[PDB]
Amino acid sequence: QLSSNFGAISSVLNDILSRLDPPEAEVQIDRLITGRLQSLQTYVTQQLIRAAEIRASANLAATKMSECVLGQSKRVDFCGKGYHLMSFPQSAPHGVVFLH
Amino acid sequence: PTNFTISVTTEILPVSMTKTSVDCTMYICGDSTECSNLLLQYGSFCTQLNRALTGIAVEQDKNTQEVFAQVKQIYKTPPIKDFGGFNFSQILPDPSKPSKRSPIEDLLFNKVTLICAQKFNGLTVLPPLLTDEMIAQYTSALLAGTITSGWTFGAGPALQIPFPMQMAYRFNGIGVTQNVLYENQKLIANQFNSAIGKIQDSLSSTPSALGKLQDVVNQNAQALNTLVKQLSSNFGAISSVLNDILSRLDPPEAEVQIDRLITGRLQSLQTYVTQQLIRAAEIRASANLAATKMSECVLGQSKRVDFCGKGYHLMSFPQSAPHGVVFLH
Amino acid sequence: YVGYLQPRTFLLKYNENGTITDAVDCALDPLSETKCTLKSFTVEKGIYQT
Amino acid sequence: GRDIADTTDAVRDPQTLEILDITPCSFGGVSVITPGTNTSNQVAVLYQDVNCTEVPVAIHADQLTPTWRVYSTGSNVFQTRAGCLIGAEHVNNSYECDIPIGAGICASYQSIIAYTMSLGAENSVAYSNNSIAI
Amino acid sequence: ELLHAPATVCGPKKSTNLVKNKCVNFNFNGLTGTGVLTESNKKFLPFQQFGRDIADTTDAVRDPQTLEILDITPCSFGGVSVITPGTNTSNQVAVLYQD
Amino acid sequence: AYTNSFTRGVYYPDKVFRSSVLHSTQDLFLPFFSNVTWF
């Protein structure tokens, strides 16, 4: 998103500063600033929502580690398919893998 | 204590939403090439918006698949029914109708209740993947399986057993001996039948039961209407129709006079998309809760307090509804 | 022989040595348009919008 | 006259007084169905919510080799709820869903075939009042 | 029309000699900038005089008086962090430089 | 007569070095798989 015009005569700050006198360069710089600020805000919002989703997944994983690895579970379809006996953990990049 | 009573209750949860799609250029610039040339200066906002909407769209099918697809075989019900005095007529499919729906599902279907403008400005509605017939088939298969086998078809091959023995075993699961049920069979059966009748009577006479799904429908309609009403605002320009601005002034002034409208409409679209995402999160949470409830109250007996019902849990049955599910405990 | 030119849109494959060893047209068939929109020389399984 | 959402759809004739209705001209999206290019190169195209008796004109029918709606006539024409599908044939079996189209239709590359999905096999369990299984 | 090709008409100015391995601000045919100069093993094509990146920033130059292949990289940046105990307990600090 | 020319005539767009990337250009080119008349 740094290659756009947003209505200004160019996209390089030094190009604008090397051609004109301050008052008009101020207008062009203002347009550029507004556009870039909007882009940054959008990015931050999307990141916040994704973080909430990942947190929900992490809480579920913590509960599953607490209940299946340490003890035998009577809940249907929580730890595996069928009657549960035991489970083992393994480590994967940015996650975890379970054996039922 | 000295005596006992059998009760039945209801529980309602939404699952999915409506799948909509919006086109940027038609909503913003209509069909004017100059506006498109001006818009080409703003980057790739519109691809982002379309990507977000498509991501929202696939999730509803994901949720429905997670909820209603738990078995991989379709089970049938015998044509002869003698369950020791138990009458399941109010929940089983009705073969004398072209829709193949139980009377309770028929009652539920009749209770839940700009079109050109959506068809005008680039708004479309996408159809679902699973029709209502398939969902009804899934529900009937689940009901037949739990009626004929018990909890044994959720952990392997199905095994047959008479219904009174299943009820006695479930009684044994809460701390009451088996000989209690075998000496009070008819009373329990009569209480079951009376409870089912009262459930239908209470459903068919109080309209304040299905408000949760109506709320979601109304929310979506209100959001769409608010979006459509914003195409008649100035935002600072001398008018709101592009053709008048084109026909009144030379291009140099029409440039800024169009820029104002472009900015306003972009802002409106951004707000709409953000609100939709925020709603979709809560819908997904409800769907996950419903899937867990279906797994744990229909295919087995639960010991958690106040999870499946109110009291000591015995068994539960599922039913279909528009964009949701209904449980009887 | 004699050829002719017309306006088109192209996606050019550059390598380290700065040589155009491959280039894909953008209006020939649906697969080329899908490649243009995805910006890659290979497409996986699915249904896309163009 | 106008509508509930500020739109106009009725206009009176200023010479011979009568009412007329205004309907927006057709528009829609174009989708492409491709099996993985590592395995083949055949594709199919879907047009949304249009009768395909009206799609030699929806797109301008000008291309060297058209977008595998080859001057879009010929066989392999199917009308569904989601629109018209060109580039696949209809079968009377049922399999598992490979690529979803919509409203219960799925398409797979064995050429390209379109079918209705099946939910599973059929099982009937014997029920009596004196029988069990162990 | 502004510089979209090798320049032909130029105003009066004083040329200066060429240095390397120090952060400088230069003016190449009216093109202002800042960075450091070094040597690239990759030689440009006979018809190539500019280099860019994804964000449309100038990368490498071929000098208008002598022919070389020199690269531009802005001199180093980074953040600063401060490690301190409670200000109610002491007054010493430690500083960390990132990467 | 007529003769096919499959993939020929692609020329360098501009005079800027680009290293191992994929780029978008809008320029006149010879269409692929064209009939080239022969005299």
Ligand SMILES: *[C@@H]1O[C@H](CO)[C@@H](O[C@@H]2O[C@H](CO)[C@@H](O)[C@H](O)[C@H]2NC(C)=O)[C@H](O)[C@H]1NC(C)=O
């Ligand atoms: C427990 O309550 C039930 C009612 O829910 C009683 O059932 C009645 O029993 C009498 C005894 O002869 C019958 O005449 C009635 O027809 C039964 N039904 C009703 C609705 O009254 C039952 O008797 C109670 N338990 C005990 C041990 O008395």
Ligand SMILES: *[C@@H]1O[C@H](CO)[C@@H](O[C@@H]2O[C@H](CO)[C@@H](O)[C@H](O)[C@H]2NC(C)=O)[C@H](O)[C@H]1NC(C)=O
């Ligand atoms: C199971 O219960 C239903 C509910 O009442 C019974 O349905 C009634 O059946 C009688 C006789 O067939 C009819 O006269 C009524 O009109 C029915 N009413 C309703 C609401 O369905 C059904 O008969 C019962 N099953 C059996 C085997 O007796």
Ligand SMILES: *[C@@H]1O[C@H](CO)[C@@H](O)[C@H](O)[C@H]1NC(C)=O
């Ligand atoms: C080449 O000639 C054939 C002969 O009929 C014609 O159909 C085709 O359109 C021409 N152009 C091509 C193949 O690009």
